[PDB]
Amino acid sequence: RKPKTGILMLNMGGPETLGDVHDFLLRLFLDRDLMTLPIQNKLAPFIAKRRTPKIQEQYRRIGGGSPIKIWTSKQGEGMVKLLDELSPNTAPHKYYIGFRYVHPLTEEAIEEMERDGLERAIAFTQYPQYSCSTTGSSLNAIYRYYNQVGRKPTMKWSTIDRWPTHHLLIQCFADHILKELDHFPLEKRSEVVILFSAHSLPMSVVNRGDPYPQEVSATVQKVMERLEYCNPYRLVWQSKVGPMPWLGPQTDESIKGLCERGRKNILLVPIARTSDHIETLYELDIEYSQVLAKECGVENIRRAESLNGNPLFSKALADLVHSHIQSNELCSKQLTLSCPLCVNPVCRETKSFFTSQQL
Amino acid sequence: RKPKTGILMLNMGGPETLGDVHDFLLRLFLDRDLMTLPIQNKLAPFIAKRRTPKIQEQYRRIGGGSPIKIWTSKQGEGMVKLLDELSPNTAPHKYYIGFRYVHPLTEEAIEEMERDGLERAIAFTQYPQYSCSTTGSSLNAIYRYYNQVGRKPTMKWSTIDRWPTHHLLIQCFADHILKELDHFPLEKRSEVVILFSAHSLPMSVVNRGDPYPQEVSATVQKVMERLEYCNPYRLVWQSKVGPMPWLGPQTDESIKGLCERGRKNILLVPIARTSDHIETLYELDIEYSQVLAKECGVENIRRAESLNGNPLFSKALADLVHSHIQSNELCSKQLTLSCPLCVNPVCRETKSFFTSQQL
Ligand SMILES: C[C@H](CCC(=O)O)[C@H]1CC[C@H]2[C@@H]3[C@H](O)C[C@@H]4C[C@H](O)CC[C@]4(C)[C@H]3C[C@H](O)[C@]12C
Ligand SMILES: C[C@H](CCC(=O)O)[C@H]1CC[C@H]2[C@@H]3[C@H](O)C[C@@H]4C[C@H](O)CC[C@]4(C)[C@H]3C[C@H](O)[C@]12C
Ligand SMILES: C[C@H](CCC(=O)O)[C@H]1CC[C@H]2[C@@H]3[C@H](O)C[C@@H]4C[C@H](O)CC[C@]4(C)[C@H]3C[C@H](O)[C@]12C
Ligand SMILES: C[C@H](CCC(=O)O)[C@H]1CC[C@H]2[C@@H]3[C@H](O)C[C@@H]4C[C@H](O)CC[C@]4(C)[C@H]3C[C@H](O)[C@]12C
Ligand SMILES: C[C@H](CCC(=O)O)[C@H]1CC[C@H]2[C@@H]3[C@H](O)C[C@@H]4C[C@H](O)CC[C@]4(C)[C@H]3C[C@H](O)[C@]12C
Ligand SMILES: C[C@H](CCC(=O)O)[C@H]1CC[C@H]2[C@@H]3[C@H](O)C[C@@H]4C[C@H](O)CC[C@]4(C)[C@H]3C[C@H](O)[C@]12C
Ligand code: FES
Ligand code: FES
Ligand SMILES: [Cl-]
Ligand SMILES: [Cl-]
C-alpha cells in the first residue's frame, strides 16, 4: 500500500564530501534566524569562501565527510520497521530526512512528503534537547516553506519537538558508558571521571531564555541515576568559536584542568547528539583526545560510542513516535512558551503553525 | 550514651535583626575564598559599613530580619522526632544549626557538638543543589575549624552534601506549585507560565566547573515530570549584583519580557531554597511581583509557598539522614570530583577530610 504516515527526521546535517563544504557554509550564513550580518546577502558567500578550506581540512582529518546521513538512514529504517508492527492503524510508515543546511533539505523533504499523499506528517527532531538554534530553526523551516509556497499543507502536521529524558535514550547512553568503562584498565575504572560534553551556546542565546542547557542537564542526571552514580561527572560544553562569551566550562579547558589536578583518567560522553558528527570524530577524538590530552600527560582518555546503529535506539525512536500518535498531541507543552526575551517574530508563527493544526 | 548523633544543618544564614546586618557583611567580606579584595582587612570593614544601610532597608521592608533560623529550627525539630523513631540505634538525635556568616556560626556549632560528646556528626547541607560557594563554603569551614583548633575531631563525621532530586523534596515542590495554581483565576490557570527562579552565579564561577546549574536543572525536570508538564516553564536566575556577567536569563528581565510578549500570568517558584529568605520575601515578592510587575501590566503573578513548615519536608530531611546512616557513605560520589578549573587549595583538603574519615 501507499505510505500513510511520514516521519520527518530533522537535523542540521553536515557535508557528505569535501566538495559540499562551501554550500553547507553558505546556507548557514544566509539563515537570518541564526545570525544577523550586515549586508548578509553579500557577506554570507564571502564568509563561506573564507571558511571553507579550514572546514574541508577538518573533514579531511576524519576521512573526507560527515557520517550523519548514513546513521540517520539506518536509524530511520529501523524505526519504520518497528512502527509498522507497533502501530498497524497508521501503517505503512515512511521516514524522510530533512537536513537544515545540506541535501536533502527540509524543503525538499516536505515537497516529497506532499507528493507522496501522506495522511499525516510528524516533524521529529533528532536533537533530544531543544535549542531555538537547532530544533527551533528546523521547525521554522517547515512553517516558512508553507508560508512561502503560498499553499496550506495537504497533510496533518504535528511535532515531537524534544525528548531529553526518554527512558530508552537514557538506557542507550548508560549502556554505551558502561561498555566504555570496561575498556579502561580495571585498576583505573573507579578513578575515571566522566565529562558529558555538549555543543555550547553563546551567552546572548542562553540569556534570552533558550531551553537547551536545562534540558541537557536533565539528560545528564537521568543517565547518572541509571548508572547509580558509579563515577563522578561534570557537564561541560564544546565547540565555542569566536571572541564572544559562551556557556562554559569549556570541554577543552576542563580536560586540561582535570589532568593538571591529577585526574588523568577521563571518559567523554557526547550527550546531545545521536550519531557521530565532526564534533565527536574531529573535535573530541583528534583535537582533544589525541593532541590536547597528549600535551597534558593524560593516562587514559576514551569516548563513549555514539548511539549510531544501536538497535535499542531505533526502538526508542519508534516508541517516541508510537506514544506521540496515541497521545494525539500536536507538540510539547514547552513549545507553547517562547523564550522570555525572544526577538525573532517567526517563533510565534511557527508555534502557532503547530498548535493550530486541524486534529 | 547522651545525645548520640548530631545533625549539623548548614546554611549561609541571614541577619536575624537589623542590628546583625553589619557583622553579617563584615564576615562575608573577610572571606577570602568568596572574594579577594585589595588591602582586604581594611577594605572589608569599610565596605560593610557602606552597604549596611541599604541591606538594613531591605530587611526592614520584610519585617525587620531574616526568618531562616526560625524555619531551620522548626524543620530540625521535626526531623529529630522522626529520626528517633526511624533509627533507634543511632538515637537520641540532636540537630544543630551552623550558619556560615551569622550566629550560631559553623565553628560555634562544632564546639557544642564536641562539648556534647556525640559519637557521630553529620554535616547536612540545607542547599539541595551543590555550589562551591554555598555547601562547599560550609564544608570548608568544618575542615578549617579542626585544622585551626589543631585537634582531631572527637566524633565520626560524614556529609550529606547534596540532594537535588530527593523524591520527597520533589513532592513538596510539586504540592506547593499545584496549590498555588489553584489560587489563579480559573480562566487563566492553563495560561500560567512557571518561572523556576534560583540564585544566579557569576559566569566566572560557572565556567570553572561549579556543579550547581546542572543540579538545579535536574530538580526542575523532576518537579515538571511529577506535574506531568501541566504548564510550560523556564528556569531563570535571580540576585545578580554588580557589573560582571552572571548566568541568565535574569528573573526580573524574564518577568518583564514575558509580560511584553503577552504572557501576563506567571507563577514564580523558588527552586533552590527550602524556606523563606530575603530573596523570596523582598526580591521576588516586592521588587519583582509588586513594583516590576505592576509597571509592565501583569495580570496575575504569584509565588509558590516556601517549604518552611510543611511536615512532608521534615519527613524528607529525616529520610535523607536515615538513608545516609544506613548506607554508611561518607559523602556523595560527586564531592570526590573538585571543579576542573578549581583554584582554591582548600577544596582538595576538605574533600579528603570527609573521604578519609574513620568508619
Ligand atoms: C559586526 C558583526 C557582528 C554581528 C553581530 O552583531 O552579531 C560581525 C559578525 C561577522 C563579522 C565579519 C566576519 O567575521 C568576516 C570579516 C572578518 C574581518 O576580520 C572583519 C570584517 C568581517 C567582514 C567581519 C565584520 C564584522 O565584525 C562582522 C560582520
Ligand atoms: C561551521 C561554523 C564555523 C565553526 C567551525 O569552525 O567549526 C560554525 C560557527 C558557529 C556555528 C553555529 C553556532 O554553534 C551556534 C549554533 C549552535 C547549535 O547547537 C548548532 C548550530 C549553530 C547554528 C552553529 C552551526 C555551525 O557549525 C556554526 C555556524
Ligand atoms: C566564525 C565566523 C567568522 C569566520 C570569519 O570570517 O573569520 C563568524 C561569522 C558569523 C559569526 C556568528 C554571528 O556573529 C552570530 C552569533 C553571534 C554570537 O555573538 C556568537 C555566535 C554567533 C553564531 C557568531 C559566531 C562566529 O563568530 C561566526 C559564525
Ligand atoms: C551582600 C551582597 C549584596 C547583595 C544584596 O543586594 O542583597 C551580596 C553580593 C554577592 C552575595 C553573595 C553571593 O551571591 C554568593 C552567596 C550566595 C548565597 O545564597 C548566600 C551567601 C553568598 C556568599 C552571597 C551573600 C551576599 O548576599 C552577597 C555577598
Ligand atoms: C577592584 C576590586 C575587585 C576585586 C575582585 O575582582 O574581586 C573592587 C571590588 C569592590 C571595590 C570597592 C568597593 O566597591 C567600595 C568602593 C567603591 C567606590 O566606587 C570605589 C572605591 C571602592 C573602595 C572600590 C574599589 C574597587 O573598585 C573594588 C575593591
Ligand atoms: C556589591 C558589593 C559592594 C559595592 C559597594 O561598595 O557598595 C561588592 C563588593 C565586593 C563584591 C564581590 C567580589 O567582587 C567577588 C565576586 C566576583 C564576581 O565577579 C561578582 C560577584 C562577587 C561576589 C562580587 C559581587 C559584588 O559586586 C561585591 C559583593
Ligand atoms: S528565540 Fe527562543 S522562542 Fe524565539
Ligand atoms: S571551586 Fe569547586 S571544588 Fe574548588
Ligand atoms: Cl558532521
Ligand atoms: Cl535572609
Short mmCIF file of C-alpha atoms in Angstrom, two decimals, chain A residues 75-317:
data_model
loop_
_atom_site.label_atom_id
_atom_site.label_comp_id
_atom_site.label_asym_id
_atom_site.label_seq_id
_atom_site.Cartn_x
_atom_site.Cartn_y
_atom_site.Cartn_z
CA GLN A 75 18.12 4.61 12.37
CA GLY A 76 15.08 5.69 10.24
CA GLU A 77 14.90 2.23 8.59
CA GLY A 78 14.96 0.53 11.91
CA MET A 79 12.28 2.91 13.34
CA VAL A 80 9.86 2.35 10.32
CA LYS A 81 10.19 -1.46 10.58
CA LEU A 82 9.16 -1.33 14.19
CA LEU A 83 6.34 1.23 13.72
CA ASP A 84 4.60 -0.93 11.03
CA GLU A 85 4.25 -3.59 13.68
CA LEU A 86 3.61 -1.38 16.70
CA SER A 87 1.02 0.87 15.02
CA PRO A 88 -0.94 -1.06 12.32
CA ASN A 89 -3.65 1.62 12.12
CA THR A 90 -1.14 4.23 10.98
CA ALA A 91 0.97 1.97 8.69
CA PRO A 92 2.71 1.99 6.28
CA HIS A 93 5.18 4.42 7.76
CA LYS A 94 7.86 6.10 5.81
CA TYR A 95 10.79 8.11 7.14
CA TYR A 96 12.15 11.25 5.39
CA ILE A 97 15.39 13.15 6.13
CA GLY A 98 15.10 16.94 6.40
CA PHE A 99 18.56 18.48 6.89
CA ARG A 100 18.62 22.23 7.52
CA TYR A 101 21.81 23.15 5.55
CA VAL A 102 22.63 20.23 3.12
CA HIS A 103 20.63 17.95 0.87
CA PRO A 104 18.10 16.56 1.25
CA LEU A 105 16.92 19.97 2.61
CA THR A 106 13.93 20.31 4.87
CA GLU A 107 12.02 21.92 1.96
CA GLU A 108 12.90 19.06 -0.42
CA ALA A 109 11.68 16.53 2.05
CA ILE A 110 8.32 18.34 2.61
CA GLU A 111 7.84 18.53 -1.21
CA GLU A 112 8.28 14.71 -1.39
CA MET A 113 6.04 14.00 1.55
CA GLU A 114 3.23 16.04 -0.14
CA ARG A 115 3.95 14.32 -3.47
CA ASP A 116 3.55 11.03 -1.69
CA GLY A 117 0.00 11.94 -0.40
CA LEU A 118 0.55 11.09 3.22
CA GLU A 119 -2.35 11.41 5.64
CA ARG A 120 -0.10 12.71 8.46
CA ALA A 121 3.45 14.16 8.78
CA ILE A 122 5.36 14.16 12.10
CA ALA A 123 8.25 16.69 12.43
CA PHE A 124 10.56 14.54 14.56
CA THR A 125 13.65 16.42 15.74
CA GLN A 126 16.75 14.35 16.10
CA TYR A 127 18.06 16.68 18.84
CA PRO A 128 16.69 15.25 22.17
CA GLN A 129 17.19 18.62 23.91
CA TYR A 130 15.60 21.71 22.40
CA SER A 131 17.52 24.78 21.40
CA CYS A 132 15.87 27.51 19.32
CA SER A 133 19.08 27.37 17.15
CA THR A 134 18.60 23.73 16.39
CA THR A 135 15.11 22.24 16.59
CA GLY A 136 13.52 25.72 16.56
CA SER A 137 15.38 26.53 13.27
CA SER A 138 14.21 23.19 11.68
CA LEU A 139 10.60 23.85 12.78
CA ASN A 140 10.77 27.48 11.47
CA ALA A 141 11.75 25.98 8.03
CA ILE A 142 8.57 23.97 7.96
CA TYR A 143 6.43 26.98 8.80
CA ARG A 144 8.38 29.20 6.27
CA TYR A 145 8.06 26.58 3.45
CA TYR A 146 4.24 26.73 3.50
CA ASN A 147 4.21 30.46 4.06
CA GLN A 148 6.42 30.95 1.00
CA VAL A 149 4.84 28.32 -1.33
CA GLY A 150 1.57 30.19 -0.61
CA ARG A 151 -0.44 26.97 -0.10
CA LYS A 152 -1.81 25.22 3.03
CA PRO A 153 -0.44 21.77 3.92
CA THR A 154 -2.15 18.76 2.39
CA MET A 155 -1.18 16.57 5.38
CA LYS A 156 -1.97 16.81 9.10
CA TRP A 157 1.24 18.01 10.88
CA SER A 158 2.42 17.62 14.47
CA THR A 159 5.87 17.61 16.05
CA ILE A 160 7.91 15.63 18.57
CA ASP A 161 9.96 18.73 19.38
CA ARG A 162 12.08 17.34 22.29
CA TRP A 163 12.72 14.14 24.25
CA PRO A 164 15.57 14.82 26.61
CA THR A 165 14.69 12.15 29.13
CA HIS A 166 13.05 9.31 27.12
CA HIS A 167 13.86 6.17 29.11
CA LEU A 168 15.29 4.26 26.15
CA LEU A 169 17.52 7.17 25.09
CA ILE A 170 18.83 7.21 28.69
CA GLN A 171 19.30 3.41 28.56
CA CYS A 172 21.36 3.67 25.35
CA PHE A 173 23.67 6.29 26.85
CA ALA A 174 24.09 4.35 30.08
CA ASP A 175 24.80 1.14 28.12
CA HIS A 176 27.49 2.86 25.99
CA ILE A 177 29.12 4.44 29.10
CA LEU A 178 29.32 1.09 30.92
CA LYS A 179 30.79 -0.54 27.73
CA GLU A 180 33.40 2.18 27.53
CA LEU A 181 34.22 1.99 31.39
CA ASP A 182 35.00 -1.75 30.71
CA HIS A 183 37.73 -0.70 28.30
CA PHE A 184 39.78 1.28 30.78
CA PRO A 185 42.40 -0.65 32.74
CA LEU A 186 40.50 -2.33 35.51
CA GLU A 187 42.74 -0.72 38.19
CA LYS A 188 41.63 2.79 36.93
CA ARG A 189 37.88 2.11 36.49
CA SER A 190 36.82 3.63 39.71
CA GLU A 191 39.16 6.63 39.27
CA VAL A 192 37.54 7.58 35.88
CA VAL A 193 35.89 10.98 35.79
CA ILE A 194 33.01 11.39 33.23
CA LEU A 195 32.74 14.62 31.28
CA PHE A 196 29.40 14.86 29.49
CA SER A 197 30.13 17.25 26.65
CA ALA A 198 27.52 19.10 24.59
CA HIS A 199 27.73 21.81 21.99
CA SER A 200 27.86 25.15 23.80
CA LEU A 201 25.62 28.22 23.13
CA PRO A 202 26.70 31.88 23.14
CA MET A 203 25.54 33.57 26.33
CA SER A 204 23.48 36.03 24.37
CA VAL A 205 21.35 33.00 23.41
CA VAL A 206 21.38 31.40 26.98
CA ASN A 207 20.37 34.75 28.46
CA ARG A 208 17.35 35.23 26.18
CA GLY A 209 15.85 32.06 27.55
CA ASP A 210 16.94 29.12 25.42
CA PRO A 211 15.61 25.85 26.91
CA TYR A 212 18.68 23.78 25.89
CA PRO A 213 21.13 23.91 28.88
CA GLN A 214 18.41 22.94 31.41
CA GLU A 215 17.25 20.06 29.14
CA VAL A 216 20.82 18.72 28.52
CA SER A 217 21.29 18.92 32.36
CA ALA A 218 18.20 16.73 32.73
CA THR A 219 19.53 14.12 30.34
CA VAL A 220 22.77 14.07 32.34
CA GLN A 221 21.07 13.50 35.67
CA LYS A 222 18.83 10.67 34.33
CA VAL A 223 21.90 8.87 32.87
CA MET A 224 23.82 9.24 36.14
CA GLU A 225 20.81 7.97 38.09
CA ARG A 226 20.60 4.91 35.83
CA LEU A 227 24.39 4.37 36.42
CA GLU A 228 23.85 4.66 40.20
CA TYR A 229 26.36 7.46 40.46
CA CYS A 230 29.19 4.98 39.86
CA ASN A 231 31.75 7.64 38.85
CA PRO A 232 31.82 11.39 39.40
CA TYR A 233 30.92 13.71 36.49
CA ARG A 234 30.67 17.24 35.20
CA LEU A 235 28.62 18.62 32.35
CA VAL A 236 30.87 20.81 30.10
CA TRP A 237 30.43 22.41 26.73
CA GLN A 238 32.34 22.22 23.45
CA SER A 239 32.60 23.96 20.06
CA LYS A 240 32.73 27.57 21.07
CA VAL A 241 34.02 29.78 18.25
CA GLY A 242 34.92 33.45 18.11
CA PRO A 243 35.62 36.10 20.72
CA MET A 244 32.19 36.45 22.47
CA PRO A 245 31.19 34.80 25.75
CA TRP A 246 29.65 31.34 25.59
CA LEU A 247 28.41 28.91 28.22
CA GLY A 248 31.28 27.12 29.96
CA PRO A 249 33.10 25.35 31.34
CA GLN A 250 34.72 24.52 28.01
CA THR A 251 35.37 20.86 27.35
CA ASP A 252 38.99 21.51 26.22
CA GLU A 253 39.86 23.64 29.32
CA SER A 254 38.18 21.06 31.57
CA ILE A 255 40.23 18.11 30.19
CA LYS A 256 43.41 20.11 30.61
CA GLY A 257 42.38 21.34 34.07
CA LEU A 258 41.47 17.87 35.36
CA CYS A 259 44.79 16.49 34.05
CA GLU A 260 46.66 19.37 35.79
CA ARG A 261 44.78 18.36 39.01
CA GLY A 262 45.74 14.72 38.97
CA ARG A 263 42.54 13.36 37.35
CA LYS A 264 44.17 11.68 34.36
CA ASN A 265 41.55 9.03 33.57
CA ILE A 266 38.69 10.66 31.67
CA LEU A 267 35.62 9.38 29.81
CA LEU A 268 33.97 11.83 27.35
CA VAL A 269 30.31 11.36 26.64
CA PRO A 270 28.67 13.27 23.70
CA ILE A 271 25.30 13.79 25.47
CA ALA A 272 23.45 15.95 22.93
CA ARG A 273 23.79 14.01 19.73
CA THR A 274 22.56 10.67 18.49
CA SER A 275 25.34 9.83 15.93
CA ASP A 276 28.90 10.55 15.15
CA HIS A 277 29.48 14.03 13.85
CA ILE A 278 32.56 16.22 13.16
CA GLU A 279 32.14 17.28 16.85
CA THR A 280 32.96 13.77 18.01
CA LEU A 281 35.36 12.39 15.33
CA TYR A 282 37.42 15.59 14.96
CA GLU A 283 36.95 17.88 17.90
CA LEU A 284 36.71 15.38 20.77
CA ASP A 285 38.71 12.49 19.21
CA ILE A 286 41.53 14.38 17.49
CA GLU A 287 41.82 17.93 18.89
CA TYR A 288 41.13 16.90 22.47
CA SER A 289 41.85 13.15 22.95
CA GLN A 290 44.98 12.99 20.74
CA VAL A 291 46.59 16.38 20.76
CA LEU A 292 45.47 18.21 23.89
CA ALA A 293 45.39 15.16 26.10
CA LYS A 294 48.82 14.06 24.92
CA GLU A 295 50.29 17.54 25.79
CA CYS A 296 48.86 17.38 29.33
CA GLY A 297 50.01 13.86 30.07
CA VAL A 298 46.65 12.03 30.32
CA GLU A 299 46.86 8.36 31.32
CA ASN A 300 43.65 7.18 29.66
CA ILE A 301 41.04 9.24 27.77
CA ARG A 302 38.23 7.41 25.94
CA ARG A 303 34.91 8.50 24.44
CA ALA A 304 31.61 6.59 24.76
CA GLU A 305 30.49 5.20 21.32
CA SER A 306 27.82 7.35 19.64
CA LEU A 307 24.36 5.82 19.57
CA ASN A 308 24.70 5.25 15.81
CA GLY A 309 23.25 1.83 14.84
CA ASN A 310 22.35 0.53 18.34
CA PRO A 311 19.01 -1.25 17.81
CA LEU A 312 17.77 -0.04 21.09
CA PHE A 313 18.00 3.49 19.81
CA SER A 314 15.74 2.62 16.77
CA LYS A 315 13.40 1.15 19.38
CA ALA A 316 13.46 4.48 21.23
CA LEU A 317 12.63 6.35 18.02
#
